[PDB]
Amino acid sequence: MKVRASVKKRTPECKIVRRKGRLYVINKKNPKYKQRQG
Amino acid sequence: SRIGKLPISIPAGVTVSHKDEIVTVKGPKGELSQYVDPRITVVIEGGMIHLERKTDDRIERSLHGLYRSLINNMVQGVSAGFKRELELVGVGYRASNQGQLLELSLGFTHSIFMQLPKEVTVETKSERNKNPLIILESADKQLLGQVCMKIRSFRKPEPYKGKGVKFVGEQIRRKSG
Amino acid sequence: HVDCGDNVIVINADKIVLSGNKWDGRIYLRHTGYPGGQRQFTPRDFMNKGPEYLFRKVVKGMLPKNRLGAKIIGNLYVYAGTEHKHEAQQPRQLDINSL
Amino acid sequence: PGLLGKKIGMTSVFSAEGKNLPCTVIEVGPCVVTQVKTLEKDGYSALQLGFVDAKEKHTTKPLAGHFKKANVAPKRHLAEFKNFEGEHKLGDVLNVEFFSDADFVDVVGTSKGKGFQGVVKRHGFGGVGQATHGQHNRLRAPGAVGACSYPAKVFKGTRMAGQMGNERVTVQNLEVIKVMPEHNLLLVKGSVPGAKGSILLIEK
Amino acid sequence: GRTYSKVIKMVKSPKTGAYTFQEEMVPNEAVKDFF
Amino acid sequence: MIQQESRLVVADNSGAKEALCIRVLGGTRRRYASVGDIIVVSVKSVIPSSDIKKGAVSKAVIVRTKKEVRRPDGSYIRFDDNACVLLNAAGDIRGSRIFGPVARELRGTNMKIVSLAPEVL
RNA sequence: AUCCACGUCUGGUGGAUAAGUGCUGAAAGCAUCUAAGCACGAAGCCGGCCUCAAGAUAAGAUUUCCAUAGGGUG
RNA sequence: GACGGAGUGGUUUGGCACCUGAUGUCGGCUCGUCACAUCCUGGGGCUGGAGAAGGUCCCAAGGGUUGGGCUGUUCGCCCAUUAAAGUGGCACGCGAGCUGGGUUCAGAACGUCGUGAGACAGUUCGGUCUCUAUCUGUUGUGGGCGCAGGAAAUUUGCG
RNA sequence: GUCUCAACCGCGAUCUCGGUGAAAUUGUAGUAUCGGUGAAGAUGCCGAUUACCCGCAACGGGACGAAAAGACCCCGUGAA
RNA sequence: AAAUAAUUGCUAAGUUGUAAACGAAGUCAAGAAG
Numbered sequence A: 001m002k003v004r005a006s007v008k009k010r011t012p013e014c015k016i017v018r019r020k021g022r023l024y025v026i027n028k029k030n031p032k033y034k035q036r037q038g
Numbered sequence B: 001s002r003i004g005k006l007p008i009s010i011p012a013g014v015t016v017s018h019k020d021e022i023v024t025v026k027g028p029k030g031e032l033s034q035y036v037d038p039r040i041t042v043v044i045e046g047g048m049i050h051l052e053r054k055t056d057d058r059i060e061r062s063l064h065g066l067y068r069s070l071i072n073n074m075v076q077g078v079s080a081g082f083k084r085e086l087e088l089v090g091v092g093y094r095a096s097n098q099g100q101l102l103e104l105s106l107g108f109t110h111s112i113f114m115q116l117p118k119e120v121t122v123e124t125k126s127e128r129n130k131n132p133l134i135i136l137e138s139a140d141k142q143l144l145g146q147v148c149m150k151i152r153s154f155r156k157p158e159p160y161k162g163k164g165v166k167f168v169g170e171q172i173r174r175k176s177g
Numbered sequence C: 001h002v003d004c005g006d007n008v009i010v011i012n013a014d015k016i017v018l019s020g021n022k023w024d025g026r027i028y029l030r031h032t033g034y035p036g037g038q039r040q041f042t043p044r045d046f047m048n049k050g051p052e053y054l055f056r057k058v059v060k061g062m063l064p065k066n067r068l069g070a071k072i073i074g075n076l077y078v079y080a081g082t083e084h085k086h087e088a089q090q091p092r093q094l095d096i097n098s099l
Numbered sequence D: 001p002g003l004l005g006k007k008i009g010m011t012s013v014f015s016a017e018g019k020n021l022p023c024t025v026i027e028v029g030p031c032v033v034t035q036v037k038t039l040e041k042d043g044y045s046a047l048q049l050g051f052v053d054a055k056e057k058h059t060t061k062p063l064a065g066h067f068k069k070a071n072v073a074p075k076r077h078l079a080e081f082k083n084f085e086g087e088h089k090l091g092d093v094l095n096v097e098f099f100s101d102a103d104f105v106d107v108v109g110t111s112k113g114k115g116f117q118g119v120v121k122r123h124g125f126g127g128v129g130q131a132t133h134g135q136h137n138r139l140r141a142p143g144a145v146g147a148c149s150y151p152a153k154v155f156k157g158t159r160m161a162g163q164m165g166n167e168r169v170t171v172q173n174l175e176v177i178k179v180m181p182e183h184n185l186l187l188v189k190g191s192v193p194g195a196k197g198s199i200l201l202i203e204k
Numbered sequence E: 001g002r003t004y005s006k007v008i009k010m011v012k013s014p015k016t017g018a019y020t021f022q023e024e025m026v027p028n029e030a031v032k033d034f035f
Numbered sequence F: 001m002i003q004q005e006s007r008l009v010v011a012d013n014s015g016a017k018e019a020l021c022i023r024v025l026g027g028t029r030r031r032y033a034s035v036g037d038i039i040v041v042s043v044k045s046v047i048p049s050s051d052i053k054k055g056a057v058s059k060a061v062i063v064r065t066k067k068e069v070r071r072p073d074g075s076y077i078r079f080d081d082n083a084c085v086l087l088n089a090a091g092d093i094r095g096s097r098i099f100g101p102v103a104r105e106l107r108g109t110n111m112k113i114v115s116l117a118p119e120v121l
Numbered sequence G: 001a002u003c004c005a006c007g008u009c010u011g012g013u014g015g016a017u018a019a020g021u022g023c024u025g026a027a028a029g030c031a032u033c034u035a036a037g038c039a040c041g042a043a044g045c046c047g048g049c050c051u052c053a054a055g056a057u058a059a060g061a062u063u064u065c066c067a068u069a070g071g072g073u074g
Numbered sequence H: 001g002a003c004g005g006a007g008u009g010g011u012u013u014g015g016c017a018c019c020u021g022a023u024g025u026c027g028g029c030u031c032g033u034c035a036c037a038u039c040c041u042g043g044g045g046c047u048g049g050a051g052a053a054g055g056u057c058c059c060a061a062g063g064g065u066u067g068g069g070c071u072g073u074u075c076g077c078c079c080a081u082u083a084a085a086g087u088g089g090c091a092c093g094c095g096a097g098c099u100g101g102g103u104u105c106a107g108a109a110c111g112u113c114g115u116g117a118g119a120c121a122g123u124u125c126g127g128u129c130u131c132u133a134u135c136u137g138u139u140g141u142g143g144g145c146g147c148a149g150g151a152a153a154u155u156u157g158c159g
Numbered sequence I: 001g002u003c004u005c006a007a008c009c010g011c012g013a014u015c016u017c018g019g020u021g022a023a024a025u026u027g028u029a030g031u032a033u034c035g036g037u038g039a040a041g042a043u044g045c046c047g048a049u050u051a052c053c054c055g056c057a058a059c060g061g062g063a064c065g066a067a068a069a070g071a072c073c074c075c076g077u078g079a080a
Numbered sequence J: 001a002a003a004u005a006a007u008u009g010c011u012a013a014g015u016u017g018u019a020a021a022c023g024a025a026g027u028c029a030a031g032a033a034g
């Protein structure tokens, strides 16, 4: 997981979800693209 | 919703009711009760379950599909059931149940003993030269999913070899060393 | 400058309603007087002690901050259930919605 | 649960394994139940015990009516213990055999009184400077008591000189060496607070 | 080794109603007591 | 009761004669070292034509102390001096003979000292 | 004897959570730990341990005595 | 992570000159208290993570966080340890609490500048640290009255 | 015993009682805390918070505490 | 001190009642291409 002020997809299989007021980028196939704080 | 505007064809030999905001499905595998929110209404007609909502607001658009699926999961739960197969991978890993007691040797120093509720029956077909297989059945998707991931949590599969507790034929993240 | 109000009895106070995310979202702050002595608590923390500990704190702060206000807060009696013992005083009934 | 005792003194004994052990001798004398406290009347359940025989000349009339009700000989010391098992009633008698099944005990006492003491002995302060090297008169001084204009005050809880000792102290998990029912004697390993002849509470 | 073993059973909870998870580590010759 | 800057007799035939304690091992503010403890020393003096040199840094183990040592059976032992024995990097001793008595505490630490000492306690 | 350490003995003991992990699951036919619900999850928070503590002027409770009870001075 | 860009803070060096018939100054000692931008210990995500050992980021301030040689030193270098030898604020915390080695009085000397009296991006030896605590603050310990008659004990625990 | 790292002992001072009895200082005071505000670092302003009335011992954070019309610095068509 | 006044919408953040480059677009109104 990395924390950025601007989170993007960066990969075609990434999806942006909101979990308790915060944005996350999730990717089960390749977890190295996980992000937080959209 | 597209999902929540779908009838559920009530199968043979199961009875459905509605009393005090609670929807209750009874069948061969047991009975399941699910509270339904007063702003999403259901009526049992012709042996079919129809849902409808008054206002098109997002607080009901989310609830409409949600309550169609919770009932649709209950009806198939009390008629057929639900299947999950766990396959222990890695030498020295054995599974064997006596009654409802489950015994697991997953590589630690200690052993693991788990008692399941009567909702989740347990069976274990473990052949020689072949990996042990854990089979769980129930009528509740949510609870059987709760038990299945607790067993897998004891030993999650690793990438370097396929070793660990996996769902049967599950796609596994692999990574050479 | 005189105590001219009415003695008030509140009943069914355990069914008071707070809106929003206020029960465990409204932070109170107080200090013990020792260094590093600030503490937090919520309206639900008061409710555990009892209705008379939330109502007294809320009604205080809407009263004058003087000696007279300290006296008149003692003219308030708050009860959880519907049962009290003041039948010797002959309490009158008032619809608070009429105020 | 527990009983009242009197501190006698210390000695050292050899065990069967062949170890030298410091032991404290306590007279856990007979205690009578002087009052039973219950939920429905008092708000909690406990037992009040009385330990040392008292002359009538030393017992006030309010306390005389207290023991006469319980129908026991008046006592000098009174204490409460909770969480018993056996439902003793008024006027029952308890003794050292209560601890005959006890492996460890807690002892509550009052420490020896040191009077008014300085920061060096009360709190272990280091002292200011050396004994030489320009020292004038702050050998046993506390040093600074705070910061400058911000704060601009001494904080609560600052460690200073004052009264030391003569206070309730608890020592936990004392190993029981032997129980002597003949003399109402109990033997424990280690030391307990207080001077000889002081009154102790021993918790099972 | 062979000085303890892990035991789990699930009990319904009054606060919610769904099953919780009870866990300990008891010596190998004590699980029959627990279950 | 040995601490930093203490001087000990060297009680083996390692060549060294007097040693100065630099550190008591095994803890942030460990103040004192007793019999059977490990310390770090500097060699202060040597016999002419010896193996180790004056000013070398070495590990050592204490075998005698002037401060009395307590035993669980109620007995005590003290000696006329403080003495140690130099050890090598692999934990063994650098000499052949031990001169003088050694304490019984080393029966639980180093059997090499006890086997080749004139007397134990 | 007392006072001491360099001595001796003793001590540092369920709930709700953070970052995270999930189950079921729509809005949005799929996906999704969340939107309705639910199971976890830190030496941290609250309890649990020790001491003080009803001037807690909201001044609490119990047992008994007096209306010779009980005290002060010595 | 180059070329570039947007902010936050006010612990550095500055800019301004707004408070001051006197607002004691470096370093150390003593005594602390607070923050978290975490050194150790606790919990996690990712890894170019086989294991072991790491790297990086996230949550976390409960406790802990060494002794020496040199130097007035802060800071640094070195020696030996430790789980670790954190970073800062509080008048660069703290001199009506200590010291007085340094800086910054009057003596003297060197280099250097000046015709000289003298002077210093310098250096060197020496050179008085005052006050009986009123208010508040803090640590202990009492007297009076109250607590809806007066007393002797035992107590619950708001905190 | 300079220190690790302090411990104990004796007299004088100290504390209590009897006798005698000053001084520095002092606009008036029933003189609490926190943050804010402000001639820009608040006992005294604002909003909250805490606090029954009156002493004694002990320590020095604040009252930009006291003492001295700053010696530094600049200024005076000052002085030596 | 004086309206728990009347009517119509927006906000779910206690935002409010007294900061930016850059993200995601949470939601409401009016359009454009297709």
Ligand SMILES: C=C[C@]1(C)C[C@@H](OC(=O)CS[C@@H]2CC[C@@H](N)C[C@H]2O)[C@]2(C)[C@H](C)CC[C@]3(CCC(=O)[C@H]32)[C@@H](C)[C@@H]1O
Pocket: H022, H023, H024, H025, H104, I070, I071, I072
């Ligand atoms: C005399 C004034 C002092 C004691 C000290 C003063 O130091 C100086 O004057 C350094 S110059 C020095 C003076 C003596 C001369 N003979 C030689 C010359 O070298 C200092 C540090 C400040 C720079 C000014 C303000 C101050 C209060 C706060 C403070 O820290 C003080 C004043 C008001 C203070 O009363």
Ligand SMILES: [K+]
Pocket: D151, D152, D153
């Ligand atoms: K202040």
Ligand SMILES: [K+]
Pocket: J018
């Ligand atoms: K304003």
Ligand SMILES: [Mg+2]
Pocket: D112, D113, D114, D115
């Ligand atoms: Mg005494």
Ligand SMILES: [Mg+2]
Pocket: D126, D127
């Ligand atoms: Mg000292």
Ligand SMILES: [Mg+2]
Pocket: D134, D135, D136
């Ligand atoms: Mg001096």
Ligand SMILES: [Mg+2]
Pocket: D135, D136, D137
């Ligand atoms: Mg002196």
Ligand SMILES: [Mg+2]
Pocket: G025
């Ligand atoms: Mg779905």
Ligand SMILES: [Mg+2]
Pocket: none
């Ligand atoms: Mg500043």
Ligand SMILES: [Mg+2]
Pocket: none
């Ligand atoms: Mg002035």
Ligand SMILES: [Mg+2]
Pocket: none
């Ligand atoms: Mg942090």
Ligand SMILES: [Mg+2]
Pocket: H092
């Ligand atoms: Mg300073």
Ligand SMILES: [Mg+2]
Pocket: H095, H129
């Ligand atoms: Mg001074």
Ligand SMILES: [Mg+2]
Pocket: none
């Ligand atoms: Mg000062």
Ligand SMILES: [Mg+2]
Pocket: none
């Ligand atoms: Mg000169």
Ligand SMILES: [Mg+2]
Pocket: none
């Ligand atoms: Mg001289």
